[PDB]
């Protein structure tokens, strides 16, 4: 599995994975904000 890093540039994969992680975290957090049950700032009662 270590040969993955002789195929792709380690920096490029680091930049792409972090960008995907940042986008996904933003998308999920706002997905929870748009629902009633998981809006922590909204303080909705379950």
């Amino acid at each position: 599995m270590w040969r993955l890093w002789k195929l792709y540039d380690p920096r490029r994969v680091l930049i792409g994975i972090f960008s995907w992680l940042a986008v996904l975290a933003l998308v999920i957090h706002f997905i929870l904000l748009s629902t009633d049950r998981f809006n922590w700032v909204g303080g909705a009662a379950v």
Binding site: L14, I15, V41, G42
Partner: protein
């Protein structure tokens, strides 16, 4: 973990981290300002 700086430029990452954290700090403050329970300028009841 110091070897992280042999992959990504330290000069580039430091500057993009200040810009990135600028957006994130601005975003979270503005998200709280858009609530009612955490808008400190409005000071709504909690």
């Amino acid at each position: 973990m110091w070897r992280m700086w042999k992959i990504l430029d330290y000069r580039r990452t430091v500057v993009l981290a200040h810009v990135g954290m600028a957006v994130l700090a601005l975003l979270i403050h503005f998200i709280l300002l858009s609530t009612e329970n955490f808008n400190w300028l409005q000071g709504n009841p909690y």
